[PDB]
Amino acid sequence: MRDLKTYLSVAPVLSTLWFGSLAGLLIEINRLFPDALTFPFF
Amino acid sequence: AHWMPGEPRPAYLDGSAPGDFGFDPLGLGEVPANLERYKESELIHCRWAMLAVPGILVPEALGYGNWVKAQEWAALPGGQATYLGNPVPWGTLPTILAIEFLAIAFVEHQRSMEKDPEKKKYPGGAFDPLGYSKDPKKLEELKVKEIKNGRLALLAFVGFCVQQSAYPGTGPLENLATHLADPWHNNIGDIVIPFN
Amino acid sequence: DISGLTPCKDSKQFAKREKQQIKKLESSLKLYAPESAPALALNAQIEKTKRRFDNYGKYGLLCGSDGLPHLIVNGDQRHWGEFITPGILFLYIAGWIGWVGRSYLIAISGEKKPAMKEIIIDVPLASRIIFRGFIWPVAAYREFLNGDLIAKD
Amino acid sequence: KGEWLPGLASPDYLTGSLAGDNGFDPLGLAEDPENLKWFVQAELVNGRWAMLGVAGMLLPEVFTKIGIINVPEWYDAGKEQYFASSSTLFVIEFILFHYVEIRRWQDIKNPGSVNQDPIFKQYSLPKGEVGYPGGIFNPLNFAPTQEAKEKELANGRLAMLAFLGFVVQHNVTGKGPFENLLQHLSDPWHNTIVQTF
Amino acid sequence: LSPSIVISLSTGLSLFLGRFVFFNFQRENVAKQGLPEQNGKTHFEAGDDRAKEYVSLLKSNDPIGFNIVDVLAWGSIGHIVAYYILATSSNGYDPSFF
Ligand code: CLA
Numbered sequence: 013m014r015d016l017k018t019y020l021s022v023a024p025v026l027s028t029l030w031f032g033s034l035a036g037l038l039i040e041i042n043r044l045f046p047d048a049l050t051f052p053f054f
Numbered sequence: 055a056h057w058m059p060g061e062p063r064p065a066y067l068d069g070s071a072p073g074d075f076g077f078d079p080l081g082l083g084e085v086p087a088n089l090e091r092y093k094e095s096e097l098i099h100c101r102w103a104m105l106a107v108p109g110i111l112v113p114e115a116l117g118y119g120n121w122v123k124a125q126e127w128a129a130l131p132g133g134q135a136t137y138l139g140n141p142v143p144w145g146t147l148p149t150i151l152a153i154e155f156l157a158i159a160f161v162e163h164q165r166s167m168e169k170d171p172e173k174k175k176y177p178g179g180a181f182d183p184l185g186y187s188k189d190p191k192k193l194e195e196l197k198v199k200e201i202k203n204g205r206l207a208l209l210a211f212v213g214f215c216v217q218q219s220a221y222p223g224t225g226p227l228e229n230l231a232t233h234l235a236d237p238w239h240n241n242i243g244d245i246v247i248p249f250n
Numbered sequence: 251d252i253s254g255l256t257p258c259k260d261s262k263q264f265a266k267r268e269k270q271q272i273k274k275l276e277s278s279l280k281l282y283a284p285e286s287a288p289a290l291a292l293n294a295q296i297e298k299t300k301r302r303f304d305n306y307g308k309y310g311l312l313c314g315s316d317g318l319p320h321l322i323v324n325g326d327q328r329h330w331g332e333f334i335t336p337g338i339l340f341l342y343i344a345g346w347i348g349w350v351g352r353s354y355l356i357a358i359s360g361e362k363k364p365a366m367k368e369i370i371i372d373v374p375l376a377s378r379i380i381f382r383g384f385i386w387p388v389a390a391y392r393e394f395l396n397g398d399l400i401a402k403d
Numbered sequence: 404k405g406e407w408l409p410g411l412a413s414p415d416y417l418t419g420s421l422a423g424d425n426g427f428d429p430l431g432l433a434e435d436p437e438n439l440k441w442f443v444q445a446e447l448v449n450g451r452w453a454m455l456g457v458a459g460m461l462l463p464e465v466f467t468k469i470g471i472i473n474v475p476e477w478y479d480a481g482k483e484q485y486f487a488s489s490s491t492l493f494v495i496e497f498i499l500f501h502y503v504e505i506r507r508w509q510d511i512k513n514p515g516s517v518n519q520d521p522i523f524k525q526y527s528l529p530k531g532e533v534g535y536p537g538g539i540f541n542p543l544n545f546a547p548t549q550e551a552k553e554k555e556l557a558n559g560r561l562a563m564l565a566f567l568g569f570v571v572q573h574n575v576t577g578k579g580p581f582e583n584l585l586q587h588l589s590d591p592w593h594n595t596i597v598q599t600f
Numbered sequence: 601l602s603p604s605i606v607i608s609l610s611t612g613l614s615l616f617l618g619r620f621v622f623f624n625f626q627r628e629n630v631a632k633q634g635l636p637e638q639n640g641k642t643h644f645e646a647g648d649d650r651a652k653e654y655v656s657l658l659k660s661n662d663p664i665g666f667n668i669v670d671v672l673a674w675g676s677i678g679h680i681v682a683y684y685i686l687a688t689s690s691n692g693y694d695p696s697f698f
């Protein structure tokens with residue numbers, strides 16, 4: 013869709029998409045590996 | 055003549071000076087007056103260190119010391135130097151410091167007042183008996199020999215000091231004896247890589 | 251045992267904290283039916299707590315007199331996993347970001363009006379630039395040696 | 404020379420002149436030519452050391468299993484007792500690697516700088532290209548043709564990933580490489596990465 | 601060593617260094633620094649009528665130029681080093697490194 017990809021390219025729409033994806037990533041990591049205080053995998 | 059083949063030579067290090075192998079990475083001798091001061095101080099450090107290496111090895115081979123044992127007597131109040139077993143009657147700490155200061159200050163401050171930068175490093179005359187200065191074709195060779203043996207003695211003094219730092223209570227000939235007894239398992243590797 | 255801290259698998263105050271939190275959760279677990287959904291969520295939180303304390307036990311965390319995992323960030327290998335192994339993992343990721351957003355800014359620096367790409371991000375160009383920062387440390391290293399990291403005004 | 408992803412074009416900085424030039428630079432690392440000629444050398448040396456490493460941690464194992472000669476499995480090979488210490492080896496591997504690697508450094512800085520011996524000044528090295536010294540590094544005198552350089556870089560790129568596979572097949576498996584190969588050939592559809600995790 | 605001997609010897613060996621050894625260096629450094637310069641001019645040249653370098657106290661005769669102020673300076677160093685010697689010797693302190 014022309015000019016919708018330009019709107020979704022705009023800084024707030026793109027920032028909310030990036031930070032929603034990133035926040036879901038961190039959230040699901042903390043579900044998978046909750047309560048982390050060390051990196052023991054070396 | 056180059057400390058590292060392939061590295062470009064500094065334009066102020068041509069090779070004409072004795073021991074001028076072009077080693078100035080940090081760029082200290084870029085201005086010529088500082089370079090003359092550095093040459094004088096290099097030769098002074100060299101001569102002192104290479105006089106010191108006999109004064110460290112010889113009294114440890116036969117003098118019954120280990121070049122730091124010769125200093126512990128002054129760290130304890132009451133006790134004087136054992137110059138080849140016999141005690142010296144010239145006092146222990148303060149008066150030897152007085153004689154050292156009053157002698158080497160005079161010597162080094164009559165050295166300081168020299169203005170000719172060649173006599174500032176290579177005075178000669180009274181400091182050149184035996185006439186080993188009347189032929190520059192070999193005097194340049196001898197200056198290179200002085201610089202080379204002196205840089206070797208400076209590195210050997212780093213060896214003394216750091217072998218004293220790693221092993222606190224020993225001497226260099228004891229280090230060489232340990233390396234001749236068991237050379238592989240008693241080298242630097244146990245210190246650069248400490249097991250704990 | 252550095253800095254006068256007993257390990258957390260051996261610290262009695264750490265186990266006491268575990269037991270206190272577990273009793274605090276169980277006292278909230280009694281009010282619900284044992285098969286109900288709040289009760290199951292509380293039990294899942296209880297197992298999460300128990301394995302959290304077990305994992306802080308096994309990962310070499312040191313516990314003080316208060317009985318809480320302290321982080322030894324000095325450089326001791328036994329505790330690199332507390333600060334340095336994460337820290338590098340930060341400086342990588344962070345240096346990914348800055349090496350991306352910088353590179354993007356250099357790729358849209360030569361436009362006519364380069365400000366209308368700051369607010370309207372070229373997703374193709376940004377996606378091409380994003381993975382350039384995967385192995386960013388060698389690019390930043392070489393650009394420091396080549397002088398392309400610092401503008402010459 | 405060829406292409407690694409036919410949908411993509413080889414970048415302008417990879418003209419095909421170099422050996423192994425399949426155009427693989429998606430992340431634009433060798434965009435500056437100085438970085439390109441440095442990473443050529445880094446590739447060659449990491450690949451040659453990886454070939455030696457893989458050949459020194461696999462061939463011990465395919466000879467241990469068949470019983471021709473019993474030797475440790477490259478991760479229990481450090482803890483064995485040798486005629487020197489655990490650090491004396493590091494001292495020697497510092498003393499006489501600093502010398503050979505700094506001379507290689509001076510070569511990859513300026514090519515014709517370091518080719519003659521310090522001691523025996525007559526026994527120089529021929530003017531070969533950078534990363535390919537020749538001379539006493541070529542005693543059998545097999546020619547360094549471009550096909551041979553491509554074969555070198557291919558086996559080296561393969562040995563690098565082989566070493567990485569070894570490190571990750573001991574980090575999250577615990578066993579040796581060839582034992583993992585025999586475990587795969589036992590039941591390939593049940594002895595893979597997606598059964599260990 | 602009695603303290604009078606210590607004081608006399610250290611003072612003598614201090615103004616001996618000052619008269620003969622560390623004279624030309626001190627005096628050439630003095631001439632190098634010269635005077636305190638307030639905005640190019642000296643303190644007395646700019647005014648103040650009190651920072652005039654005294655010459656009635658510095659004119660004293662000597663073939664090399666020793667003045668009473670150098671006698672005070674080398675000699676204050678003398679008494680100081682002497683009392684350092686005396687107190688450091690009279691204090692029975694064990695450095696006990698070994
Ligand atoms: C700046 C200060 C600071 C610091 C240092 C921390 C640090 C931490 N917090 Mg705290 N926190 C902070 C501020 C801070 N927080 C603030 C301000 C708040 C309020 C908003 C919180 C609220 C908070 C809560 C509520 C929780 C934490 C948790 C945590 C832990 C995170 C565990 C986790 O999910 O990471 C895991 C790691 C990641 C998510 C990073 C993954 C990155 C991706 C996957 C890329 C990595 C791979 C990459 C490709 C490289 C691979 C190498 C190579 C192969 C290429 C950690 C100890 C959690 C915890 O466990 O408690 C201790 C937790 O529950 N924090």
Ligand SMILES: CC(/C=C/C=C(C)/C=C/[C@@]12O[C@]1(C)C[C@@H](O)CC2(C)C)=C\C=C\C=C(C)\C=C\C=C(C)\C=C\[C@@]12O[C@]1(C)C[C@@H](O)CC2(C)C
Binds near residue numbers: 427450456458460564
């Ligand atoms: C040198 C090397 C290994 C050397 C190993 C040695 C000496 C092993 C020695 C031993 O085993 C023995 C013999 C015996 C044991 O007793 C002792 C040890 C000591 C254990 C590995 C390099 C290993 C190097 C590796 C794995 C590098 C992988 C790089 C990749 C995949 C790069 C990808 C890219 O960079 C490109 C190509 C282009 C970019 O544009 C895009 C991306 C994608 C970023």
